[PDB]
Amino acid sequence: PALTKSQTDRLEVLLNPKDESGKPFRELESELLSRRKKDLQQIYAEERENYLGKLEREITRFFVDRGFLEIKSPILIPLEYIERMGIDNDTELSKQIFRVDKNFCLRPMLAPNLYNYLRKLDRALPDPIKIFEIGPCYRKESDGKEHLEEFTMLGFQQMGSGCTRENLESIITDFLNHLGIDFKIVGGDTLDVMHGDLELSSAVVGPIPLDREWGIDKPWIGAGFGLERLLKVKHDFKNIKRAARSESYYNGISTNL
Amino acid sequence: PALTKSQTDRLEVLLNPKDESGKPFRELESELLSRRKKDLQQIYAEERENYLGKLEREITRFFVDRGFLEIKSPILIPLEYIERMGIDNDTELSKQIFRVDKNFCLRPMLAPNLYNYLRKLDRALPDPIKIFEIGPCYRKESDGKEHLEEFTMLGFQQMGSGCTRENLESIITDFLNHLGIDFKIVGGDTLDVMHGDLELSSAVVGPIPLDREWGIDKPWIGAGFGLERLLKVKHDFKNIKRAARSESYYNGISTNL
Ligand SMILES: Nc1ncnc2c1ncn2[C@@H]1O[C@H](COP(=O)(O)OP(=O)(O)OP(=O)(O)O)[C@@H](O)[C@H]1O
Numbered sequence: 338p339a340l341t342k343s344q345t346d347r348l349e350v351l352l353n354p355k356d357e358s359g360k361p362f363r364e365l366e367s368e369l370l371s372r373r374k375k376d377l378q379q380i381y382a383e384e385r386e387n388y389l390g391k392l393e394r395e396i397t398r399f400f401v402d403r404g405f406l407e408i409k410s411p412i413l414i415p416l417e418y419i420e421r422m423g424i425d426n427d428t429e430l431s432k433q434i435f436r437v438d439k440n441f442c443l444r445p446m447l448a449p450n451l452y453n454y455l456r457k458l459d460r461a462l463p464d465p466i467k468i469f470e471i472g473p474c475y476r477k478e479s480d481g482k483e484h485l486e487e488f489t490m491l492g493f494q495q496m497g498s499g500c501t502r503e504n505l506e507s508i509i510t511d512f513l514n515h516l517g518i519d520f521k522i523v524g525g526d527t528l529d530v531m532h533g534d535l536e537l538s539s540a541v542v543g544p545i546p547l548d549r550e551w552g553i554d555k556p557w558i559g560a561g562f563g564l565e566r567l568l569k570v571k572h573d574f575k576n577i578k579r580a581a582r583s584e585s586y587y588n589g590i591s592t593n594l
Numbered sequence: 595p596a597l598t599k600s601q602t603d604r605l606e607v608l609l610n611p612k613d614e615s616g617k618p619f620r621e622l623e624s625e626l627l628s629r630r631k632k633d634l635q636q637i638y639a640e641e642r643e644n645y646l647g648k649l650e651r652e653i654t655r656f657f658v659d660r661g662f663l664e665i666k667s668p669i670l671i672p673l674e675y676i677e678r679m680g681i682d683n684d685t686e687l688s689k690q691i692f693r694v695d696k697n698f699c700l701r702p703m704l705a706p707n708l709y710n711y712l713r714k715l716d717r718a719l720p721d722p723i724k725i726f727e728i729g730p731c732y733r734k735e736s737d738g739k740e741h742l743e744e745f746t747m748l749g750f751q752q753m754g755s756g757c758t759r760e761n762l763e764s765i766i767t768d769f770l771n772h773l774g775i776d777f778k779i780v781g782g783d784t785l786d787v788m789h790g791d792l793e794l795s796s797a798v799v800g801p802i803p804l805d806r807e808w809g810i811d812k813p814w815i816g817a818g819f820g821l822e823r824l825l826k827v828k829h830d831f832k833n834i835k836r837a838a839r840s841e842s843y844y845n846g847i848s849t850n851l
Pocket residue numbers: 476478483484485486488490536537538539561562563564565566
């Protein structure tokens with residue numbers, strides 16, 4: 338007979354994008370279970386690397402080799418940083434903040450910490466100043482197809498000379514062509530890097546009025562990329578949860594076998 | 595005249611371990627400022643890697659090469675995981691938890707997530723099962739010399755065959771000798787890896803009664819290492835804050851120049 342909706346959901350959990358009727362549910366499930374176990378066995382036998390960790394290391398190598406300084410800043414940040422970013426109750430992000438204690442929150446973005454590093458490093462480093470960070474960011478989200486509440490962001494910034502829209506688009510282009518990800522750029526200037534209807538990045542060509550609140554008075558360019566969305570596109574995951582920090586999926590493979 | 599306590603504090607911020615009277619504060623400060631700027635310039639010109647990120651990549655390579663599977667699990671975990679770990683109000687850790695919303699918290703440890711992966715991977719992977727994770731952990735702490743509220747932990751576990759105290763001590767020994775860190779092991783069995791009076795790790799030889807609550811019924815060995823404490827020892831930092839995710843220090847160098 339026909340597969341139930343619940344049975345189809347179960348199979349889709351076990352179904353990989355590269356997988357290719359009269360067979361009952363138990364046979365279809367048994368076949369997929371066998372395939373997914375072998376996938377995990379192959380990873381365990383060979384590379385043993387996590388997709389998220391591996392992507393972070395690859396992105397790190399890319400930006401270090403292009404002269405960007407690797408930053409590891411706090412994930413737990415002051416609540417005042419959020420207000421200082423021009424985030425008031427009349428914006429969407431104000432309601433998306435994970436508050437911790439009275440004075441802190443989980444960072445929903447990388448810009449405040451990177452802003453602070455630009456200002457401080459300006460007193461020590463030659464022009465131009467190039468920095469980047471990869472790490473966890475947190476936002477309360479209502480959706481679940483393209484959004485995670487716990488995700489990983491790449492953020493990079495260049496300050497001083499060479500901060501043009503052309504140079505920014507060049508870095509973005511080299512980056513995504515390096516990863517093998519198809520894209521289009523749509524758009525101080527605010528640009529969005531799109532994969533179909535999926536936003537991979539928001540990019541900015543400074544200066545912008547916000548800079549003054551952070552002690553920045555130089556031209557700058559930068560962008561923020563979601564690593565899970567990059568993984569989702571590269572590995573053709575139907576749902577972004579396959580690319581997340583998770584106990585339910587490893588490298589897009591269901592751990593409930 | 596004599597340096598004030600405040601002036602000495604200022605200098606100690608700028609002072610590096612490898613640095614070597616009648617000179618006034620302003621001269622001493624100016625000399626150190628010049629040295630620290632050059633240090634940052636040298637990093638920026640050459641390697642451009644963050645110590646914490648670099649250590650994580652080195653540790654990752656070590657365990658992957660020895661057959662351990664790289665795990666990236668959620669940092670935001672259910673509060674029930676804490677209770678299930680046998681953490682009640684009569685223990686110290688109960689008061690150290692960063693609570694988020696009503697049902698979640700920032701993980702103070704890696705064991706609950708690694709426990710879950712051991713159980714799930716047992717249905718797919720051959721014996722023995724070897725996994726590890728590196729990532730942020732959070733604990734409210736009263737001290738500040740050897741403790742951070744936001745820190746990074748290495749956790750590894752092996753389940754099944756070869757789970758002996760000897761094998762556990764062998765992995766620990768090879769690991770720390772690889773990093774070039776002096777240590778002594780002091781001590782199911784609970785072992786502590788010490789550097790002088792500083793605890794680098796707590797290690798465990800299972801099985802332990804707690805395993806049943808997590809669906810584990812096999813022998814296992816494992817340990818948890820603090821990456822910032824490893825950095826502190828390796829780079830001879832006087833205060834652990836020099837090794838933390840920070841806006842005040844980069845690779846042990848003050849960013850307030
Ligand atoms: N909840 C989330 N889950 C996964 N990735 C995210 C999330 N929020 C943002 N990102 C990624 O971070 C990048 C930069 O953050 P930004 O604030 O510009 O996103 P956004 O415009 O809020 O995204 P969206 O419009 O899709 O909600 C985005 O391009 C996206 O790839």
